[PDB]
Amino acid sequence: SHMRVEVLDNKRRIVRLRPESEEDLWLLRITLRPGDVVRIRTSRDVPVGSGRKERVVMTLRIRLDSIEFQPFTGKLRISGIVVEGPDEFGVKGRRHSTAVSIGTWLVVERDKGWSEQELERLASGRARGTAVIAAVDYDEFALAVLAGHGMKILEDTSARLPGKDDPSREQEVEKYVDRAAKRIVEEAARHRSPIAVIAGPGQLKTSVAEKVQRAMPSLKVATVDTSMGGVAGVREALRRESVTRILRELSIVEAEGVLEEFLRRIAKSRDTVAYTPGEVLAVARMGAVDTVLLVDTLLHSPDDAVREAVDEALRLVESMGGRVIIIPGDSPAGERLVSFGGVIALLRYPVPQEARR
Amino acid sequence: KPHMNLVVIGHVDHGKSTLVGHLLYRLGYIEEKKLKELEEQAKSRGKESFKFAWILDKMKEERERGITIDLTFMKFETKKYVFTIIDAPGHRDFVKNMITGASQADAAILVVSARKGEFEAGMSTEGQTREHLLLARTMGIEQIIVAVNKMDAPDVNYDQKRYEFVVSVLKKFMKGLGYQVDKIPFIPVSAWKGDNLIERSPNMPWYNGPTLVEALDQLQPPAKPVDKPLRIPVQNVYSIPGAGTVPVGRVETGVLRVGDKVVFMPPGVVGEVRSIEMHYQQLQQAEPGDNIGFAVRGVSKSDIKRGDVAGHLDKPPTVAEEFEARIFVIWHPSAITVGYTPVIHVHTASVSSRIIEIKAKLDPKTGQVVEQNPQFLKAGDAAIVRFKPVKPLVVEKFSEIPQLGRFAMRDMNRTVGIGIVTDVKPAKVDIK
Numbered sequence: 022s023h024m025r026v027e028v029l030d031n032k033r034r035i036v037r038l039r040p041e042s043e044e045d046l047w048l049l050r051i052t053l054r055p056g057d058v059v060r061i062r063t064s065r066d067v068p069v070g071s072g073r074k075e076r077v078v079m080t081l082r083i084r085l086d087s088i089e090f091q092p093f094t095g096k097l098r099i100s101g102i103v104v105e106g107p108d109e110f111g112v113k114g115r116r117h118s119t120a121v122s123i124g125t126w127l128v129v130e131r132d133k134g135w136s137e138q139e140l141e142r143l144a145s146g147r148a149r150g151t152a153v154i155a156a157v158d159y160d161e162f163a164l165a166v167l168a169g170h171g172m173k174i175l176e177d178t179s180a181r182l183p184g185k186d187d188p189s190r191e192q193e194v195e196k197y198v199d200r201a202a203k204r205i206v207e208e209a210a211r212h213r214s215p216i217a218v219i220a221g222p223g224q225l226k227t228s229v230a231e232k233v234q235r236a237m238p239s240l241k242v243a244t245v246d247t248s249m250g251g252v253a254g255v256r257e258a259l260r261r262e263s264v265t266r267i268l269r270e271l272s273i274v275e276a277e278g279v280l281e282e283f284l285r286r287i288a289k290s291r292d293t294v295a296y297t298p299g300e301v302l303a304v305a306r307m308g309a310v311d312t313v314l315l316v317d318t319l320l321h322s323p324d325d326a327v328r329e330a331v332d333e334a335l336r337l338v339e340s341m342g343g344r345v346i347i348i349p350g351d352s353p354a355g356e357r358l359v360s361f362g363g364v365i366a367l368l369r370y371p372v373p374q375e376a377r378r
Numbered sequence: 379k380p381h382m383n384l385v386v387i388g389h390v391d392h393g394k395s396t397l398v399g400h401l402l403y404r405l406g407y408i409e410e411k412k413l414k415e416l417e418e419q420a421k422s423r424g425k426e427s428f429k430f431a432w433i434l435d436k437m438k439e440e441r442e443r444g445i446t447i448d449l450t451f452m453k454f455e456t457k458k459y460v461f462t463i464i465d466a467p468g469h470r471d472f473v474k475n476m477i478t479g480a481s482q483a484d485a486a487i488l489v490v491s492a493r494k495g496e497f498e499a500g501m502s503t504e505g506q507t508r509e510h511l512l513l514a515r516t517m518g519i520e521q522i523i524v525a526v527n528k529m530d531a532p533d534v535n536y537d538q539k540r541y542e543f544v545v546s547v548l549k550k551f552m553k554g555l556g557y558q559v560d561k562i563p564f565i566p567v568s569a570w571k572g573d574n575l576i577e578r579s580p581n582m583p584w585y586n587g588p589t590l591v592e593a594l595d596q597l598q599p600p601a602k603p604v605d606k607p608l609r610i611p612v613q614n615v616y617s618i619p620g621a622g623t624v625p626v627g628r629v630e631t632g633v634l635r636v637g638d639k640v641v642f643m644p645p646g647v648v649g650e651v652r653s654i655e656m657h658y659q660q661l662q663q664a665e666p667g668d669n670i671g672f673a674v675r676g677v678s679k680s681d682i683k684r685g686d687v688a689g690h691l692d693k694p695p696t697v698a699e700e701f702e703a704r705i706f707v708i709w710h711p712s713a714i715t716v717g718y719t720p721v722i723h724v725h726t727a728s729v730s731s732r733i734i735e736i737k738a739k740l741d742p743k744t745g746q747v748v749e750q751n752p753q754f755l756k757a758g759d760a761a762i763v764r765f766k767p768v769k770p771l772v773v774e775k776f777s778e779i780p781q782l783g784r785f786a787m788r789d790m791n792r793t794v795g796i797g798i799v800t801d802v803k804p805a806k807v808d809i810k
């Protein structure tokens with residue numbers, strides 16, 4: 022149900038753990054850092070012996086160099102320079118690149134020590150699942166899969182339908198909805214979705230909804246009114262009140278609220294927001310941060326200074342009662358963030374610009 | 379005998395479809411057995427006062443609702459003119475379709491209800507008398523006839539006091555949009571009864587102004603930009619037996635001839651024009667303002683869609699990789715920033731586009747650059763911004779082909795902004 026996490030040494034530098042869900046894999050993405058040394062049982066191709074190779078399962082300690090996550094693949098890609106292994110194979114100094122899959126045991130050693138918030142973060146993962154969202158109108162149909170940690174478009178399609186006067190226009194829209202229902206079922210199945218949010222203007226969405234309910238009767242099927250179909254509709258639906266409630270446990274969705282509020286303040290009460298790594302650290306030190314919205318790519322920036330600033334600021338706001346929310350760059354909200362350097366913050370009180378030093 | 383396109387606009391249910399339907403019936407364009415069959419059909423199902431509207435509304439969801447969803451096209455003529463009248467949806471969920479109608483139009487009939495509560499709905503901050511007047515303006519319609527309607531309703535009853543009020547309110551707003559309001563008719567009518575459609579209405583002796591048909595003949599037909607490269611935004615695509623696949627659209631610029639080879643942008647598909655039909659009439663060429671179907675050899679219905687634009691291979695429609703625009707923010711609840719992605723409505727197309735730069739805030743009175751790269755924009759700032767369409771989009775500089783270079787910015791069922799395009803960064807032409 023969540024990542025088992027057990028601290029091995031008295032110096033609390035070494036932790037054994039086992040991802041048991043993709044959210045656990047995401048938790049590793051936002052937690053692990055370059056310099057961490059991991060230890061897995063992988064395997065590699067060794068030249069034993071004469072002109073021949075054998076694939077040998079072996080345990081290595083790798084100084085992490087690269088941590089990479091792509092949603093809906095169930096894989097955390099990792100890479101680095103091997104710092105220890107069976108000496109009979111001479112792997113030290115050589116790059117190992119593998120993937121941590123769900124269920125893969127791995128031990129990781131952090132020199133600075135594993136903080137207590139970090140350990141808790143790691144174990145937090147409620148294996149919250151997945152949802153699918155579609156939007157349909159007479160022009161377009163689009164379908165997406167949603168998780169806490171990512172969003173992926175699965176279908177984008179003009180309904181190259183006749184104009185309304187056309188004879189058997191009724192038949193062609195009937196085929197259209199059938200197509201849309203069949204896709205919504207296929208992906209909800211493929212992704213183990215309990216919930217299917219079906220959006221759009223007017224009755225098309227409910228024609229579609231009825232048919233997918235009938236094919237997956239245990240599925241939770243919610244219609245949402247929305248200005249249009251297609252991808253823009255899926256994105257609008259993420260902002261409607263009903264969906265924000267149903268999907269409230271998803272970061273991608275919760276981000277939308279704090280971005281809406283952030284923009285409101287940009288317009289109406291400017292000194293109560295901050296953005297940019299540097300500014301957010303500044304106001305996080307004051308104790309001014311109520312919540313911080315942060316794209317995960319900042320956690321893994323190639324600039325050491327900004328990784329340290331961001332992790333610090335985040336350590337700070339957590340310690341003084343604040344909420345921290347990490348989202349993928351690959352999300353509607355995460356794309357709005359890039360203009361603000363990838364982090365925004367809602368402040369508890371007005372901090373003047375002259376004071377953010 | 380000159381041709382013009384009429385788009386019928388206004389708030390939801392203020393009577394656009396009955397007004398068009400009845401006008402056609404009176405003018406002699408609908409058979410008795412048909413208007414009566416519809417009367418039976420209507421009454422038979424929920425709807426009842428819809429027999430006139432149902433000679434436009436024919437979609438399944440449309441009849442059940444009973445709402446106009448997508449444009450309807452009909453032909454008729456007056457003494458001076460032959461007309462394509464375009465019946466637009468009023469419901470806010472379908473203003474994208476009203477917009478494609480407005481871009482096609484030479485002139486608009488604004489239908490506004492005088493009924494207590496109704497008129498106020500449509501003229502409210504979020505109502506569609508207001509929205510459609512805005513959109514018509516930004517889409518380049520400068521000839522407008524307003525029909526003040528439902529004059530027979532119990533709560534109006536031909537009252538000149540009411541008429542005068544709605545006109546007052548209407549005129550104020552339209553004047554601020556930039557309309558020379560005194561040069562445009564406000565015709566008290568009953569779409570349902572027929573008051574002031576064709577002949578004078580006994581019930582409203584105080585009017586004396588022109589009837590609807592009269593107002594129609596006072597319209598002056600637009601200019602015909604020949605010697606501009608051919609542009610036909612496609613409104614719909616049909617697979618028709620005897621013809622093949624035929625796009626339908628209004629010729630915006632240039633001239634099309636049977637036998638011409640034509641390219642559809644952005645798909646880059648090419649085909650040869652086999653035929654041209656307008657109002658069921660065979661043409662050998664289509665001039666600007668013509669609203670045509672044209673059969674295209676070598677292209678299939680899955681290759682091209684609404685929002686694509688046809689042109690000669692010679693000089694193909696521009697596909698904007700990026701574009702620059704002078705905009706004005708009508709409404710937005712907070713701050714517009716870089717990254718904001720409204721949907722852009724131009725000619726027959728609607729494509730979301732990411733603001734990738736706010737180059738400048740402009741003085742709202744004299745237009746000088748007042749701030750470069752401002753943090754944000756609000757209603758009602760004027761700015762120069764750069765856009766990046768999220769899918770390929772045909773746009774054209776306003777100074778070159780205006781009808782392909784004026785647009786509304788819409789987000790979240792609201793009209794947020796309007797703009798004209800000042801620069802285009804063309805994508806590389808690909809051809810098939």
Ligand SMILES: Nc1nc2c(ncn2[C@@H]2O[C@H](COP(=O)(O)OP(=O)(O)OP(=O)(O)O)[C@@H](O)[C@H]2O)c(=O)[nH]1
Binds near residue numbers: 567
């Ligand atoms: N009394 C009276 N009723 C009218 C008049 N015009 C329209 N109505 C009624 O208003 C209702 C709306 O009719 P429609 O023609 O569908 O109005 P619409 O503006 O075309 O509707 P949408 O296209 O969906 O926005 C119908 O029940 C009509 O009978 C009128 O002039 N007088």
Ligand SMILES: [Mg+2]
Binds near residue numbers: 465
């Ligand atoms: Mg109608």
